[PDB]
């Protein structure tokens, strides 16, 4: 089997991407943020504290003839910015772009933090990291991909995120028309439960490539590109007026600037992020100071190849016995 679903930016800045997911019988379609950095499929629901729902579409398990309460199971998760959610668990039929998994754990939110409430466009998350990170207790549950894998034509999924445009998540096949040149595969460590890999270096604009190992994770659930302070300083030094602002919380730059590209290495291959991809717009409405799309990972404890990087590539998440990651230009 295969599946193919369009993923759409939630706003004009590509702050995140949402993908329609069918849950239950009859289908209830929710727009979920596919997150290769986490391993829980959770949704706003009829069980979510009423005051914490503000425009999201909810899953109502009582209206699904295939929903079954997973007895005694609960979940609770906290993300990189301290946002959080928790609740109970059902199993139900879940379909993505024509690919169907029966008995998928659907984690129904009883509580969500303010950041989730305040974002009406995201109805929940669909985790695509390794199932070892799933938070369901006392019996850990499998991700959608892990459940589907055996049925897939090939044990892979691909992320093809758009710049200011929709893109595609495919399951079970590689669309050879969706990229240019070849796909370069690179080793993955699953020790921390992430799609963790090592970039071979970087360049800023038309500058010389610096060969240096940068360990990081491919995280579609993170908007920006977080890299070591040395690398980030070298990038922003090429932008007149750019500065790291403690008050704003990172590098900002004059909105009048034309940004240089940023290149990262995948083995001997090179992925070029155009400068425009690195502009996240005014820091506050009407400001002429803009927020940068490349930020320091210092104090995070890990580098993050988030959407800013991933959207410049066609990315293969290879879930074979020994997982690997593939990157192609597009
Ligand atoms: C939960 C856990 C399993 C630990 N996985 C993680 O926390 C993973 C994996 C790594 C863990 C160690 C630290 C680095 C990454 C962070 N990621 C965070 C990853 O799972 C999570 C998914 C998510 C999506 C939507 C809304 C909330 C949360 N993204 C995040 O925590 C980051 C935080 C940030 N500001 O960088 N969220 C965003 O980049 C983000 C999401 C939505 C937005 C909407 C509008 C405007 C900006 C937006 N920014």
Swiss-Prot record:
Domain of life of the native organism: Eukaryota
GO biological process: proteolysis
EC numbers: 3.4.23.22
Catalytic residues, chain numbering: 35, 199
Gene name of the encoded protein: EAPA
Keywords annotated in UniProt: Aspartyl protease, Disulfide bond, Hydrolase, Protease, Signal, Zymogen
Parent-record interval covered: 90 to 419 of 419
Disulfide bonds: 255-290
Molecular functions per Gene Ontology: aspartic-type endopeptidase activity
Family affiliation: Belongs to the peptidase A1 family.
Domain Peptidase A1: 17-328
Reactions that this protein is recorded to catalyse: Hydrolysis of proteins with specificity similar to that of pepsin A, prefers hydrophobic residues at P1 and P1', but does not cleave 14-Ala-|-Leu-15 in the B chain of insulin or Z-Glu-Tyr. Clots milk
The protein's name in its UniProt record: Endothiapepsin
């Amino acid at each position: 089997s295969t599946g193919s679903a369009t993923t759409t930016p939630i706003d004009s800045l590509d702050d995140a991407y949402i993908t329609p997911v069918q849950i239950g019988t009859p289908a209830q379609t929710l727009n979920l943020d596919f997150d290769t950095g986490s391993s829980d499929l959770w949704v706003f629901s009829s069980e979510t504290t009423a005051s914490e729902v503000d425009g999201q579409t909810i899953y109502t398990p009582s209206k699904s003839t295939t929903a079954k309460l997973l007895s005694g199971a609960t979940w609770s998760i906290s993300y990189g910015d301290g946002s959080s959610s928790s609740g109970d668990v059902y199993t139900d039929t879940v379909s993505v772009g024509g690919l169907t998994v029966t008995g998928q754990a659907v984690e129904s939110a009883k509580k969500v933090s303010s950041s989730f409430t305040e974002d009406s466009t995201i109805d929940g998350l669909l985790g695509l990291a390794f199932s070892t990170l799933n938070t369901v207790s006392p019996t850990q549950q499998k991700t959608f991909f892990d459940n589907a894998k055996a049925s897939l034509d090939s044990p892979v999924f691909t992320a093809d995120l758009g710049y200011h445009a929709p893109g595609t998540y495919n399951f079970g096949f590689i669309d050879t028309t969706a990229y240019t040149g070849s796909i370069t595969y690179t080793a993955v460590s699953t020790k921390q439960g992430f799609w963790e890999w090592t970039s071979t270096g970087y360049a800023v604009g038309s500058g010389t490539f610096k060969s240096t190992s940068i360990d990081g994770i491919a995280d579609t659930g993170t908007t920006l590109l977080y890299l070591p302070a040395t690398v980030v300083s070298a990038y922003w030094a090429q932008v007149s007026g750019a500065k790291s602002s403690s008050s704003v919380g990172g590098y900002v730059f004059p909105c009048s600037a034309t940004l240089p590209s940023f290149t990262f290495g995948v083995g001997s291959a090179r992925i070029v992020i155009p400068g425009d991809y690195i502009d996240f717009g005014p820091i506050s409405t009407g400001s002429s100071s803009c927020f940068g799309g490349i930020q320091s990972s210092a104090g995070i404890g890990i580098n993050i190849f988030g959407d800013v990087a991933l959207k410049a590539a066609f990315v293969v998440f290879n879930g074979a016995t020994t997982p690997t990651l593939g990157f192609a230009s597009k």
